[PDB]
Amino acid sequence: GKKVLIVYAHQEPKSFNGSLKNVAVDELSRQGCTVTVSDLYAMNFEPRATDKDITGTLSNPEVFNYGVETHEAYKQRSLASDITDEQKKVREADLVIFQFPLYWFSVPAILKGWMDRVLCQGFAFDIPGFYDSGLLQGKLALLSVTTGGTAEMYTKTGVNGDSRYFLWPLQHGTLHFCGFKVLAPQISFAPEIASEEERKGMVAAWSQRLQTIWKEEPIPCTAHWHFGQ
Amino acid sequence: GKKVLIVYAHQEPKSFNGSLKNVAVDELSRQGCTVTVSDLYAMNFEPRATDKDITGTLSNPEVFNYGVETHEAYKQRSLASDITDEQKKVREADLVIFQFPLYWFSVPAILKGWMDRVLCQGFAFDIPGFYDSGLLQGKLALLSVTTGGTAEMYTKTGVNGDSRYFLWPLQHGTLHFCGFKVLAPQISFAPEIASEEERKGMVAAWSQRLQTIWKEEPIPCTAHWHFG
Ligand SMILES: Cc1cc2nc3c(=O)[nH]c(=O)nc-3n(C[C@H](O)[C@H](O)[C@H](O)COP(=O)(O)OP(=O)(O)OC[C@H]3O[C@@H](n4cnc5c(N)ncnc54)[C@H](O)[C@@H]3O)c2cc1C
Ligand SMILES: Cc1cc2nc3c(=O)[nH]c(=O)nc-3n(C[C@H](O)[C@H](O)[C@H](O)COP(=O)(O)OP(=O)(O)OC[C@H]3O[C@@H](n4cnc5c(N)ncnc54)[C@H](O)[C@@H]3O)c2cc1C
Ligand SMILES: CNS(=O)(=O)c1ccc2cccc(CCNC(C)=O)c2c1
Ligand SMILES: CNS(=O)(=O)c1ccc2cccc(CCNC(C)=O)c2c1
Ligand SMILES: [Zn+2]
Ligand SMILES: [Zn+2]
Secondary structure, rough: OEEEEEOOOOOOOOOOHHHHHHHHHHHHHOOEEEEEEEEEOOOOOOOOHHHHHHOOOOOOOOOOOHHHHHHHHHHHHOOOOOHHHHHHHHHHHHHHEHHHHHHHOOOHHHHHHHHHHHHOOOOOOOOOHHHHHHOOOOOOEEEEEOOOOOOOOOOOOOOOOOHHHHHHHHHHHHHHHHEEEEEEEEOOOOOOOOHHHHHHHHHHHHHHHHHOHHHHHOOOOOHHHHHHO | EEEEEEEOOOOOOOOOOHHHHHHHHHHHHHHHOEEEEEOOOOOOOOOOHHHHHEEOOOOOOOOOOOOHHHHHHHHHOEHHHHHHHHHHHHHHOOEEEEEOOEOOOOHHHHHHHHHHOOOOOOOOOOOOHHHHHHOOOOOEEEEEEEEEOOOHHHHHOOOOOOHHHHHHHHHHHHHHHHOOOOOOOEEEEEOOOOOHHHHHHHHHHHHHHHOOOHHHOOOOOOOOHHOO
């Protein structure tokens, strides 16, 4: 038995992202997995890191330091509840899938705020206690990304450079940092430009990949994997 | 004369980021420059890309596509005023400085939201008009970043790898894409563990650099500069 959390960042249920999220729910549910979706836009998820995220006495109420205050709020249990709700889903999950359209070579801000606010010190990492010693060790994570640009544009030579370049702050800087083993990204290139048939193909490929997800090895999440040479 | 926009993303006025923003204001103001600050947290700036970003009736109210609807709204002058207030500051600016602490090897989400919502199609980029022909061509941009991690941790075989690796999505995928010339980043490593004196030193060097900012050449914003 496995638990999966899909952190989903798209405004439109009818989108190609919505379809990728739905096929993931359908296929994982079919296998008998436990499935949870955090539909960030539907939740009106708060993306800003503010003093509203701590409800207790501040450690230093004259100079606000978000990192310090949320680490302390975590240990004390005075974090805002929207944060702790997400931490419970993550804590219980064996696999976390992030489903989102690429926005400026990165995640939409609403999903960036989920990372900023949910993956706090004490919960996701400590100092020391990061990368291979991250607190979410033993967990899997997978970025399922859609793009405006074609596969060709995301090669080394390559108007945008290699797709793996923009994956670094996310796969390595965030997921590996917190101790996840990172599965290979699912990148569904340029659905807006693609045929009906090619879109159906991309959706079907994701579905079919999920059938055997539990048998995959993670990627070696390193500079060499991301940048080569 | 010149106009400078500082897009500033820190919750605390007494912070090191706050000091760097303040020094930038003081020095560019001293030079006679026109200076504007967008203090994102104090403005409670909306980070989410939503259908509220378009006023009046939508181009396609059946299936919402953020990119298409904001492109059409830009052309038809139907964007939410917070977005158009920012676009005006950017349009008039000669130089845009982003002042922010590194969050997950990127910008804090409030600032990511500024990028998502302000740099819309038709305003910042188009087909064509991206990278070198981006619609903001001729403007300068500069990332002024603070870090938790020491300079050593940001070497190609330090714990975090090379600084330039995380610079890529911001400098190239965003700033260069919109047509900005990118000046070299100002990176203030690990102010929290630095001495009182090293801090004052980092603040001063920023101020010093700003004295000759208009003499600078933009980096070659290439794959080679970042990774090779
Ligand atoms: C602020 C912003 C920044 C961006 N930055 C970047 C960037 O840096 N790099 C980049 O490459 N792109 C960028 N983009 C483009 C963006 O990544 C794409 O627009 C997005 O990935 C497309 O995904 P979608 O779900 O919205 O597509 P959709 O428009 O929803 O889908 C495309 C088509 O597929 C159809 N569809 C939906 N479900 C199915 C299905 N089950 N079977 C067949 N067809 C289906 C839809 O009807 C639609 O016609 C950016 C966009 C924005 C708005
Ligand atoms: C969600 C999140 C994600 C993060 N991700 C990363 C990451 O990926 N990589 C990374 O390296 N770090 C990361 N960090 C750490 C973060 O980048 C640092 O905490 C931040 O950059 C420090 O800058 P500051 O302005 O907040 O420092 P401050 O704590 O505000 O300043 C440090 C000290 O300088 C003092 N000071 C202020 N002004 C002056 C002045 N004029 N002269 C002398 N002293 C002064 C202050 O009083 C304080 O004592 C993350 C933090 C958070 C909260
Ligand atoms: C190099 N081209 S790309 O398709 O890999 C690409 C890169 C960055 C982008 C940033 C914002 C939006 C878009 C959507 C499409 N824009 C246009 C030009 O109509 C982007 C597309
Ligand atoms: C230890 N390595 S690091 O300094 O390069 C680094 C890397 C990623 C981080 C992600 C979230 C938080 C922090 C610590 C920052 N806390 C405060 C007080 O603001 C990080 C520190
Ligand atoms: Zn890694
Ligand atoms: Zn570039």
